[PDB]
C-alpha cells in the first residue's frame, strides 16, 4: 500500500511512529507538509495520508492517548479500496504493538499499552471531503438506502 | 499468537473465515465446542478464542454484517498481553480483506466490503469475566482512577 506520512511532531517517539509505519508501507511522501503529501497522493493515486500531529510525543509522555489522523482518498467504492482500508487499518494495529516498549517506563503510561492511539479519520470520496468520518462510515451511510 | 477457533456455522464462507484465521495463528483448538476451546486456552495459557457463530454465512449472504466474537483471557496487564491484543486485532482486519472477493457477488453485499464484520469482545481478567467488553475498555476503566 502506498501511503504519505506527514509528521509534524519533532519528538523521538513521533519519529519512531513514522519509522514503524514506513517499514510497512510504500512511502510516497515523508515529511511535514500536508499540501505536498496531498499532492504525492493525488499524483500517485495512493489511498491515505497518515498524520502524526504536533503534540503526539508529549501526549504519550503524559500518559495520554496520542492523536493519529488518516485522510483517505477514495476514488471508487470497490475491492481495491476495501483492500487498502483493511490493510492500512491492520497496519495501525501493528504500530500500537511497535510502540509498546516505550510505554513501559511510567505507571502514567500503562493504560496506553492496550490503547495508545486516538485514531481520527477523514474521507475523500470522489473529491467530496467528509471530515471525521471513516470510509466504513461513509460507505454504511450511502449503502443504508 | 496462540488462538482457539470455535466454528459453529457449517457454511462455506464460515469455513473460509476459519481457514484464513488459522493460517495466521498457532491453532490451539479448532472445532465446534466452546468448552473444549476454553480448555485448550487455559491449558496453553493462550490469549483468545475466536468464535464463528451459527448465522455467520447467512448474514453475509443477506448483505448483513456477520458476527464474530473474541473471548480474551488476560492473566496480566502487561507487555505480552498488549502485544496479543494488538496482534490479534490486526489479524481480524486482515481477515476482512481475505473475505472480500466473496462479497463481490451481490449488490446486497457491497457495504460489507468495507465493513463486513460485527466484532463482539469478551474479557477475562484474572478469572473475572467481563462480557461485551474489550481489553482496552477493561483496562481504560481500571486505569481511569
Ligand atoms: Ca531527532
Ligand atoms: Ca478500519
Ligand atoms: Ca463444507
Ligand atoms: Ca483491538
Q: Determine if residue A89 is labeled as part of a ligand binding site.
A: yes
- Parallel, antiparallel, or unpaired: how do β-strands A66-74 and A117-125 relate? parallel
Q: Determine if residue B94 is labeled as part of a ligand binding site.
A: no
Backbone dihedral region for residue B22 (phi beyond 0: left; psi -120 to 50: alpha; all else: beta): alpha
Method for this entry: X-ray
Contact of B86 with chain A, judged by CB distance below 8 Å, is answered with yes
Q: Which residues contact B46 (CB under 8 A, 6 or more apart)?
A: B1, B2, B3, B4, B28, B40, B73
Q: Residue B69 belongs to what H/E stretch?
A: strand B66-74
Nearest to A17 by CA among A72, A47, A45, A55: A55
Cell 492496550 belongs to residue? A114
- List the grid coordinates of B103: 462479497
Which domains occur in chain A, in start order?
A: 1-145 (3.40.1710.10)
- List the grid coordinates of B123: 474479557
A87 and B94 within 8 Å at the Cβ level: the answer is: yes
Query: B126 φ, ψ to 5°?
Result: 50, 40
Give the 3-state DSSP-derived string for chain A, with helices as H, strands as E and coil as C: CEEEEEECCCCHHHHHHHHHHHCCCEEEEEECCHHHHHHHHHHHCCCEEEEECCCHHHHHHHCCCEEEEEEEEECCCCHHHHHHHHHHHHHHHHHHHCCHHHHCCCCCCCHHHCCCEEEEEEEEECCEEECCCCHHHHHHHHCCC
B15 CA distance to ligand 3 middle (Å): 7
B87 and A94 within 8 Å at the Cβ level: the answer is: yes
Contact of B89 with chain A, judged by CB distance below 8 Å, is answered with yes
Contact of B105 with chain A, judged by CB distance below 8 Å, is answered with no
What value does the CA radius of gyration of chain A take, rounded to a whole number of Å? 15
* Residue A133 · residue A72 · CB < 8 Å: no
Amino acid at each position: 500500500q502506498k501511503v504519505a506520512i506527514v509528521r509534524e511532531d519533532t519528538g523521538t517517539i513521533a519519529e519512531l511512529a513514522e519509522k514503524a509505519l514506513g517499514n510497512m508501507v510504500d512511502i510516497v511522501y515523508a515529511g511535514s507538509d500536508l499540501k505536498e503529501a496531498e499532492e504525492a497522493v493525488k499524483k500517485e493515486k495512493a489511498p491515505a495520508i497518515i498524520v502524526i500531529p504536533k503534540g503526539f510525543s508529549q501526549s504519550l509522555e503524559s500518559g495520554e492517548k496520542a492523536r493519529l489522523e488518516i485522510v483517505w482518498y477514495l476514488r471508487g467504492t470497490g475491492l481495491s479500496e476495501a483492500v487498502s482500508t483493511g490493510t492500512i487499518s491492520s497496519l495501525i494495529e501493528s504500530l500500537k504493538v511497535q510502540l509498546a516498549s516505550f510505554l513501559l517506563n511510567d505507571p502514567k503510561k500503562a493504560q496506553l499499552l492496550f490503547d495508545p492511539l486516538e485514531i481520527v479519520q477523514h474521507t475523500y470520496l470522489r473529491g467530496s471531503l467528509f471530515k471525521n468520518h471513516s470510509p466504513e462510515a461513509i460507505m454504511n451511510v450511502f449503502y443504508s438506502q
